[PDB]
């Protein structure tokens, strides 16, 4: 219940502004267009079952930059009550072209969370009128790019009416359209086809704020509007970022907000879950079960270990929250503009930080000067999303993730000295330095997976062929050729073609790699059993058993073990495709490159018409002299220069990746003519396999087991601390 | 001297059309715009030192398709005299954006040739008024793409005046602008900066015909306008194709026309020469001397051998001539449209023949049904052109040549049975079949050069390292790694980047390959000298000496030997770059892929304005119901489909090329795990080098010597027949 404000509709005959409830002449309010329309009586019929905010919707045409809304004298309904309304929590939802099911899921999760907070009993912050402290800001990116089933859902809530959007106002290009309403209707069911909207006494009001950008700038500009724009006016305590389609759990927003009672917390995130469908029906898809296992282990092992140190690298799908005072200043300046100091040319970090979009913020929050903000991971809050079910869209999704992670980790390692310019105490500074070193160690390991997988596969298959001879010779040669053909084809198709065009090939390549992994598992088991009936296979069995047991125990400690059997084998079988198809495509597509009027003739009936023709000899001579003159007096734009720089930097990364991996391959296996060279050196005074292969094979597995052990200790510490 | 016709200027007061020499009201002549403007008196001053064609210039706006000009009632000045003028020779010049120096060179060569023909004494065809039998048709491609220094040269000749070009006439888009004049001024000198134009009693008139297309369609459309368009009206005996910048020799057009006195000749071409500059100054550039040698040998060996059989594959720069009756019908239909029979989908040959643009015509002229046309090569006629002097533009030029040659040869081999459906006698049919088989043999050899060069280099360097041990071990390993790095980088940069962006790398790669070739030459000489002080190096010395001697003798027989010393070493040194840089880039770039208004606000002084607003409750309810309705009722265009097909077919060619070359590499050198496989097979019961390397090394050189011998016999037969 309860609202009020003073509207700006239009002027009548007396000239004193009049309300509809109580060709026309208007008046710009302070120089910019603000209009107040009533809503249809169909909504009023539910609403009655009445103050000013429920019955009007306010359109504003924002013609300025995000960082100038207040100066230009633009406002929001929250500031214009008799007592200005103070917001505790601003929830940002970003759409690009998402359909109404995804947006419906996000809004329904938000509405359920707000209802939970409003029904809270013993709280100083939340209570019966807690909905007044929450603003839901839906920033859609382009009118041309929005779906009409989303604008139809937004309209059905009461927060959109067409007709009074304007392209320009006093020769000023309108940059954005803002629709403001407070709705009493809630979403109660979202089937595969329909969204159930209903309004009764049990519903809670939601202060929606629909922003519609005029043209599609990317997501960083949406965040620019959210943080530099409306957050400056509303002054929220916490700013929460959600994507359309990410449905928060029933208490996730409250449980994340509860994380900020520690005054040192500057940001927080929760768990992101794969949405397995109805009765886990989607778990039959190997691509979906693999992703389910990957998400569960990224949350259980990686996030807890990072949160112990104090710096988290929030996962792309999960919804995050930042304390607004934490990000004001340097972090937002780095996030939106980049390293401002820059000459006409291009620098590596400054021109490439857009690849690591949100992971910059986190870094700058932790290493902020004279401030001891920490990032913290909340396991009590979760959000479930749908994952790609087809190989091409899976590849296209992970292209962004892998490039962002690689660049963010390189940037954080290269600039770690900032940890010591911040305001943390000495112990936290040491912990953060150790964590950044460990994260770069992980990045370095992930950079050499191309060689690691091939070396493990080739050593294993050749060793079994050497030892037992039966049909493993032919199998070794055949699998070498299959690997080579698939890898060459993946390189060529990712450098030149698009994944949508060739889907059968990518599916076939994934199947080939799965069969390869099955063969490697068989070889390992066979060699181990024969040895039990040498030392290297003792090491392989002990190390792999240990790394499986640590995963299982960490899942049990986290109290979420069911993914360790329903989804493990699928992930194991698709791991070679993660190494060999996702990484190649991600590295081959780093930057997403993209390389007078004369007159008219209209004739009359007779075929006649009139013309302006050079008739005087003098003007013909003039034109002739002007062309006789041209025969006597005898880098392009910034966009293509930036495109050239991006292409150079994308192609220098692939070459270095391939060469540095083949260096290790050639050192271990003595490829590259090295075995020839040693042979001919001795002749101056080739073997099948050396002891370098044994040493490397052991080292790889020990690294895997060590990483599992470190992450197990991290997760154990996380759970123990949280439980105490 | 001597012209006349009836002009179409405009209507005066009496209404009977009036001439300027003897806002106005006009009249479409037969429904289309034809205007006749006078020329400036500056030209008249030279001209006097007078009939109708010299003093007027005729603009026509062509709004129809090339194949419809006569039906739509468009004409040319040649048909409209009292006695219609019959053309013997139509010279087509195509520009895209060439500057005035290139066009000036072409026009000056043409003018000098016409002057030679007009001064001819004992000829039935040519005489004092021979200029009346020649029409020079300059087809420029796009108004936006033409240079202004070219339109200033064309205007200075009298064949262009601006002002009366029209975009549309009676709602018909004007497709092309035709300017017609007969000029008495000639070009007498073209320095680096100025073009010397002069008019006196020694000058010869030229019937120019400047076509200016409205928008840039590519060159095949220009030929479509020339052949299906103006050639249908003029009815020439011979149609000659020239590019802007190609300067014909002083008698080249007459000597090519002389080839057509044999009634069986359907086409002909002459020699194309590299323009070495002033006093051969450009011969200092290695890239230019290499091209000079390449052109001289392509003319001496390839063209004569082809001309003996009866089918030539005219070189891209050379100017060619077709007997018009020969190309009418099937050849032009295949050249312009492709295989007309085609479903909605894409077929290989039909959708890729545009890559082999002019080489289609030649094929269809020889294999025309019931006709015994032959193609013949004329050594008495030549044209000199400028060649690229920088590596990126050289690469970009050869991209087109290599793809065209490869596709044309594949097409000619696959469809050779048509030779037997033509009208030739049995012996010529056998000769043509043999020639097509030989040409496909050459194509097949050129497809495996990637493996041939590497195998020769690796066998040679490893053999010298094995035999003498001193520092050839290190050199072998170092050169293997240099080759690998350069090849991988070339693949990655040609698949992903543009040659303009990375010029230093391409120059460095060419230098690296030149040093590699120097090392290989040294190794061959060293091994041969040591053997003389085994049998394989006897074969190498005999075979390479024989293939050099045959080249030298063929150059002497042709009476053009000077390129065998001034330009030979440069070509030898750049040959690895031809194999390894031009071919990779050509194959990696086969197809040149390229992947509501709202309202406005203007306010008065008071800030007030008027609007159309939905005021009635009924219309707001209507809009709400129309959005509540959308929530209840719950492949792209041809261009991108063709782009996807082109990408698929371009990337399937690279993969097959690489795999089929590596198959040969792995068979000969036992790479690919094959030596491992044989070793472990024997263990079930690796060497440095095998005898396969010896056999392959001999075979490659014998093939080279055999090709030299065949081409020597061909050139000898050509010269002997011509001399008899
Ligand atoms: C060094 C590489 C530098 C690394 C740079 C970049 C890393 C690239 C990794 C390639 C792995 C090569 C492994 C290797 O040792 O090469 C082997 C094969 O010799 C070759 O065929 C070399 C081909 C060059 C590959 C360049 C990649 C370009 C992709 C398109 C490729 C187009 C296909 C090119 C061929 C038509 C070496 O042969 P060998 O040792 O002399 O034979 C002795 C065998 N024996 C002892 C049993 C008798
Ligand atoms: C078969 C190929 C199928 C052809 C398909 C396509 C043709 C490609 C030509 C490559 C030439 C390979 C030559 C070869 O035999 O491979 C050798 C190296 O083993 C490898 O490293 C294989 C790497 C795959 C190359 C695929 C090209 C992709 C370019 C990007 C590449 C990314 C870099 C990938 C590595 C990080 C084989 O090793 P080996 O014989 O087991 O060692 C024994 C040596 N010994 C006897 C002296 C002890």
Numbering used by the authors:
A (entry chain A), B (entry chain B): 245 to 266, 375 to 401, 409 to 892, 908 to 969, 977 to 1015, 1025 to 1075, 1087 to 1125
Please share excerpts from the published article on this structure.
In this report, we determined seven cryo-electron microscopy (cryo-EM) structures of S. cerevisiae Chs1 in the apo state and in complex with UDP-GlcNAc, UDP-GlcNAc+GlcNAc, UDP, UDP+GlcNAc, PolyB, and NikkoZ. The overall structure of Chs1 reveals a dimer architecture with a twofold symmetry and is ~100 Å tall and 110 Å wide. Each Chs1 monomer is composed of a large cytosolic soluble region and a transmembrane domain (TMD), with both the N-terminus and C-terminus in the cytosol.
Using AlphaFold2 predicted structure as initial model, we built the atomic model of Chs1 in apo state into the cryo-EM map at 2.6 Å resolution. Except for the N-terminal region and a few short loops, Chs1 is mostly ordered and well resolved. Except a short loop ranging from 245 to 271 residues, the first 374 residues of Chs1 are largely disordered and invisible in our cryo-EM maps. SDS-PAGE gel of purified Chs1-ΔSL showed the N-terminal region has been largely degradated during purification as processed by trypsin, indicating the N-terminal inhibitory region of Chs1-ΔSL is more sensitive to proteolysis. This finding is consistent with our cryo-EM map of Chs1 in apo state, which showed the segment 989-992 of swapping loop packs on segments 245-271 and 376-379 of NTR. Interestingly, we found that two phospholipid molecules fully filled this cavity and were sealed inside by EL3s. Clearly, lipids play a structural role in stabilizing the structure of the Chs1 dimer. In the apo state, the path from the active site to the chitin transmembrane channel is blocked by the VLPGA loop, in which the proline ring of P675 is stabilized by packing with the indole ring of W760. Among them, L819 of TMH1, M886 of TMH3, F911, I914, L918 of TMH4, and F1098 of TMH6 form a closed hydrophobic gate, blocking the cavity from connecting to the exoplasmic side.
